Amino acid sequence: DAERLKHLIVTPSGAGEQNMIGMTPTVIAVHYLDETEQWEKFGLEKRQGALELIKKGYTQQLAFRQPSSAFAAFVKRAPSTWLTAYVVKVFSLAVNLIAIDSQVLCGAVKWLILEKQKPDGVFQEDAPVIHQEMIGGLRNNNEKDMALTAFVLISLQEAKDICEEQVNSLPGSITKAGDFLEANYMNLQRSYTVAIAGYALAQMGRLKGPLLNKFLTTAKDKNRWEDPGKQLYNVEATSYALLALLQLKDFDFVPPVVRWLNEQRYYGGGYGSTQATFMVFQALAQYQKD
Amino acid sequence: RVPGDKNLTKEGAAALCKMKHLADKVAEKRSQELKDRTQNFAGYIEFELYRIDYWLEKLNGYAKLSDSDIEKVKEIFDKAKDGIAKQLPEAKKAGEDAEKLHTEVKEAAANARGQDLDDHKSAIDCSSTGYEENYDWSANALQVALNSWENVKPKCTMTEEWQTHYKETVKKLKELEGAHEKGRRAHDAMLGYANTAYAVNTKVEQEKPLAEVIAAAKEAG
């Protein structure tokens, strides 16, 4: 399992978007190897070198942090709600790996809540990312308000314990975004949005009743959350859906889902693999943990 | 246990299982949901007041605005706070009522479920009521379950002291649901004003001219 993950140790480089594309593989590979305990089969001496590359990616990313605590590809470009939420998502997972500045992370979380969350709980993207390949299933844009609100809310839930004391509006922001998702869940048509909003709601104990029935029923052959289209999006959605199954403590439906994800033999990679690499390894490392 | 005229039927045993189940879901789940959701409404209204204030601090994107232009934005911001604050005395009263009403709803349903359980006990299985879960735990669902029992109610039979607590559960759950609605109609009335103010902040940060920010404020109401 670890011999195929050597290509994931990437030296981060480039502007605000490219830095997070290059940073992503190294971060989740260290996280997968710590949890699954495969550092003896990979190379024990290589862990320190990987942390320095993650610190290198973290420090280079701060060159793109705007006076508003928001992120964009370049400093003179309008900040991206998706990019800021993604930075919050990678830094939330890298707190155990490298030293993350709490003001940098909690400033971004507070900017998302104060600037980009609409009064109805919906997160708004007013300046999309140039690299559309790094957003995964969000690219279709079919149900933009529902899928982007699930994405940002997942990032806020992962940064909740770190920023609860610095961002006083975080608790209420999380429930307001979860209210919108819960109210419009049963009308979702895309299997990708069922899995990303399913997990966002599962994180706050609201994936239950008819919402839990629709979530488990959109799974084709009780193993995958497949949408007719991209095989990269299906791996990403089934990873968000596996993280919801573990959160629900439903260790009855989990075995054939993990079986399918393993049967794919997905090891990350370059072009377009940002969300599928981050999510397939976050979900497989969590399955091993639970 | 008192003597009666008719034997208990399948539709009589199922009505008893449903009334115990509805009271259990109200005492352990529904009551808390109605309280949390009613009290969150007042917190959202206050957040929009606090949030507009933070945008008002930025008039001291926003730096590109001329002296005359900032007064127009400030006026729009001050009038949105007026409309949002107008809804706060009804949403605070709803959340204060839902604090007292929750404990009366939780208590009455718990008492109605301890005597209703002893009404089954040989005891009635009640496994088909959990299968036929429709997740409707309103005072109207509790009422139609009581109405269905009242039609198949054998006058050997048992006494109905549990019914006095169940009748109180229905009455108080309607009051609790009415407090949820009183705070829902206040939250929704606050949305128009908070949307106008949100649309201005976005247009002002996108450096759109004064005519554009005013046009966007008008469309969000």
Residue numbers in the entry:
A (entry chain B): 996 to 1285
B (entry chain A): 27 to 86, 94 to 154, 196 to 229, 251 to 316
Article, verbatim:
Here we demonstrate that an invariant surface glycoprotein, ISG65, is a receptor for complement component 3 (C3). Within the VSG coat are found invariant proteins, including nutrient receptors, and a family of invariant surface glycoproteins (ISGs). C3b deposition occurs by a chemical reaction involving a reactive thioester within its thioester domain (TED).
We expressed C3d in E. coli and combined it with the ectodomain of ISG65 1125G expressed in CHO cells. Two copies of the complex were present in the asymmetric unit, with each receptor contacting three different C3d molecules within the crystal lattice, with surface areas of 814, 553, and 530 Å2 for interfaces 1, 2, and 3 respectively. This allowed us to define interface 1 as the physiological interaction interface for ISG65 binding. The ordered core of the ISG65 N-terminal domain consists primarily of a three-helical bundle, with helices 1, 2, and 4 lying approximately parallel to each other, creating an elongated architecture. At the other end, short helix 5 forms a hairpin with helix 4, placing the C-terminus along the helical bundle, opposite where C3d binds. The curvature of ISG65 produces a concave surface into which C3d binds. The location of the ISG65 binding site does not overlap with the thioester of C3d, which allows ISG65 to bind to C3d that is covalently coupled on the trypanosome surface.
